[PDB]
Amino acid sequence: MADRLTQLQDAVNSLADQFCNAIGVLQQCGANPTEEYAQLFAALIARTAKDIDVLIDSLPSEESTAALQAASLYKLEEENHEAATCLEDVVYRGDMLLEKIQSALADIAQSQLKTR
Amino acid sequence: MQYIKEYTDENIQEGLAPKPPPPIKDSYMMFGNQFQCDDLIIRPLESQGIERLHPMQFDHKKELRKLNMSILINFLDLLDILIRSPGSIKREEKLEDLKLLFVHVHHLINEYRPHQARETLRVMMEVQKRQRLETAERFQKHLERVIEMIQNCLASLPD
Amino acid sequence: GPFYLMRELPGSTELTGSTNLITHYNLEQAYNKFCDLPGMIDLPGSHDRSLIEKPPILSSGTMLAGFRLHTGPL
């Protein structure tokens, strides 16, 4: 969904689920196997921890918050209204030209039928 | 399955005798399992049912960086507190403590979304203005083509 | 500075399952000994309703008696 919040939340959940099973799994199955798993698990957990640190810097600071955004929207609302008027000023010129040319063509057709 | 009868039977009759709809309530609503209390803050509230250890500043970023080490250190402390004391009761409070920590991270992270939600709203207002201007200019351009055309016709007619 | 909700870990090595529980519980020499008594019993006697005795154990007038019952020699 390309959302910062979704990615951060997902990473935390994997760590919780991934580490709860892993500790239990270590207790579950006992030379070569125990040592390799220790590194494999430490590796992932370490990777997840690094990822979490990277994520925090990306989010916006205390400044330019929601109230400020609403304030920004205000000034913007007035600007939008003006923009709308532009098109309502542009229109009706085509309408008057169109009614003029319809009157002209009706007059031409009438003259053509009356000259007979 | 059961429809209401004694509040609906008085509908087929004319005049102003039909009852008005109920005005808008300003009290707590008891419908459903959920409490659904009126005028609840949009942000989730941890004030009730959750202990508060948060700072006056209420900055998520400062806490997030500190919280991460604490959950991790506890994870490591919970690993060996089992061997240091297997029969001790404090292990399940540590899990609970861990559960409390899990309740906190999600609660603190959710703080950002309302601000994030507000940002989505501004582009909609902003994009239309970016779109409306283009339509007006395009319309003006189209009209111009027509006018220069009728001037060419008016130039070629009387000669 | 301090992390949130740090506390004191327990006493460095209390009673665990990582100790040698037998040598701490003074049972070493019995194991070092140990690592049929019917036969042991057999040496004292001959060999070793054995169906009946077990059933009796599963649930769980000496002079006068002799006088009362007489058994023919031949």
**Can you tell me the distance from the alpha carbon of B142 to that of B134, in angstroms, rounded to the nearest whole number?**
12
Choose among B115, B122, B133: nearest Cβ to A83: B133
User: Are C60 and C54 contacting, i.e. CB atoms less than 8 angstroms apart?
Assistant: no
**Can you tell me the distance from the alpha carbon of B26 to that of B7, in angstroms, rounded to the nearest whole number?**
23
Resolution for the entry shown, Å: 3.7
Choose among B66, B69, B77: nearest Cβ to C9: B77
Q: Is it the case that chain A and chain C have 3 or more CB pairs lying under 8 Å apart?
A: no
Helix ranges (DSSP H) in chain B: 60-84, 90-109, 112-156
The gap from C-alpha A100 to its chain's centroid, in whole angstroms, comes to 48
Q: B125: number of CA atoms within 13 Å, CB side?
A: 17
Q: How far apart are the first and last CA of chain C?
A: 105
**Can you tell me the distance from the alpha carbon of C10 to that of A53, in angstroms, rounded to the nearest whole number?**
31
Q: Is it the case that chain B and chain C have 3 or more CB pairs lying under 8 Å apart?
A: yes
User: Own/partner pairs for B149-154, CB < 8 Å, 24+ apart?
Assistant: none
- Whether residue C18 and residue B66 make contact (CB cut-off 8 A), yes or no, is no
Non-local CB neighbours of C32 within 8 Å, separated by 6+ positions: none
- A47 Cα to chain B: minimum distance (Å): 13
Neighbours of chain C (3+ CB pairs under 8 A): B
Non-local CB neighbours of B143 within 8 Å, separated by 6+ positions: A90, A93, A94
> For chains B and C, what is the number of CB pairs under 8 angstroms?
32
Nearest residue on chain A to B144, judged by CA atoms?
A: A94
Residue B153 is given by DSSP the state H
- Whether residue B114 and residue A9 make contact (CB cut-off 8 A), yes or no, is no
Beta-carbon count within 10 A of B108 CB = 18
B118 at A interface, C-beta within 8 A: yes
Using the Cα atoms of residue B77, residue B83, residue B86 and residue B88 in order, give the sign of their dihedral.
negative
- Partners of B77 on chain C (C-beta within 8 Å) are 6-7, 9
